[model samples]
Target: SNAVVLVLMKSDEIDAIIEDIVLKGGKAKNPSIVVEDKAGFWWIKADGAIEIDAAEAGELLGKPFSVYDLLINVSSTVGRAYTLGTKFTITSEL
Candidate 1:
């Protein structure tokens, strides 16, 4: 099942985060997930566009949602958060 993995973060803080992610070569279009805000709940959704297939990340897409702690290096043009073996969908609605 294709899924949409969401990351919840502060809407006000999303700018800095998005910039950090994108500027560090964290692609928005091929984003492993996207950061958004709905009703003031900031979020990051992973559609698995830049990485693996849906079936690969299905099980771990939406479980007990937690924060993925990744160090963003400002010096480098690209940054990697984590190596995920879980497949993501269009939504965690499952």
Candidate 2:
């Protein structure tokens, strides 16, 4: 039987860590996952948008959540985090 289920994923650790990083030196409008906390802009769109989406990325790649880990380089960007082939790990409600 096929059914449609809504999933709400949460990774407090990831959110908190990224938040601090952005607050320190990261920029806005990430274009991947993390967006501007105050404004709605991509991290790269703003100045001092240092790329820090490579540290401990494996932990957030596979598993319950399908997040995009976009790496903004000198010329272009890259993404590998996704949940195309896997299912949502969280089934219970909070």
Candidate 3:
């Protein structure tokens, strides 16, 4: 299985990420991405790759968003990760 997990800090930035994911074909339940809210943190789990565009997220947040900003909020990840310009991706080959 190509499952990826991201542990992130609880913040408004996640709202933009989630919206982006959903727009990109993530389901709220029973399929693609699974989001769990924990105290002061969030657990985002998905199969295959989870890609977020900084430009899109920035638009949603009304501020600049970058891979570095996303990385700062990410406490842990379970997958091969890559950051290229305004894109961040996490994936694994099964």
Candidate 4:
């Protein structure tokens, strides 16, 4: 069986995360990751973990983006999410 996780975020705030993912090599870290722009949201699906650091995201966005800030834009998410100081990760595994 195939396991996929879905992450839906605000379209406006997704570019930084998108660029960060691309910078890390889209399918390199994950088996597959798909990004779709729908209306005012960015729909993201992946078979592997999605991790983001607050500092890195802040750098990409040219502003301070904390874990809470990132979470605010997350309209919805599937799978398990672990949020620590300055870092956020989502995975479909235990």
- Tell me, by lDDT, which candidate is best: 3
Error of 4 at 79 (Å): 1.2
TM-score of each: 0.34, 0.24, 0.54, 0.55
- Tens-digit per-residue lDDT, 30-82, candidate 1: 54545565554445545443221223122445433322311111111122233
lDDT tens digits by residue: candidate 3, 1-94: 6667765556355656665755356764426676766664656777766654445446656565565446654445467567777766776773
User: In model 3, what lDDT does residue 18 have?
Assistant: 67
Instruction: Name the candidate, 2 or 3, with the larger lDDT value.
Output: 3
Cα displacement (angstroms), candidate 4, residue 56, comes to 10
Q: Local distance difference test, per candidate?
A: 0.37, 0.30, 0.60, 0.59
lDDT of 4 by residue, 1-94 (tens): 3455444445555656665755356658666677766656566766767664446556657565655446654434466567786676766777
Error of 3 at 36 (Å): 1.5
Runs in model 2 lying further than 4 Å from the true structure:
1-12, 26-45, 53-94
Point out the worst 10-residue segment of candidate 3 by lDDT: 21-30
lDDT of 1 at 43: 50
How do the residues 1-94 of candidate 2 rate in per-residue lDDT, one tens digit apiece? Answer: 1111111122444346556754443444433333322232132222212333332334655432223432221112222122233221211112
Our model 4 lands, by Cα RMSD against the true structure, at: 4.9
**Which sections of candidate 3 miss by over 4 Å?**
11-24, 28-30, 53-68
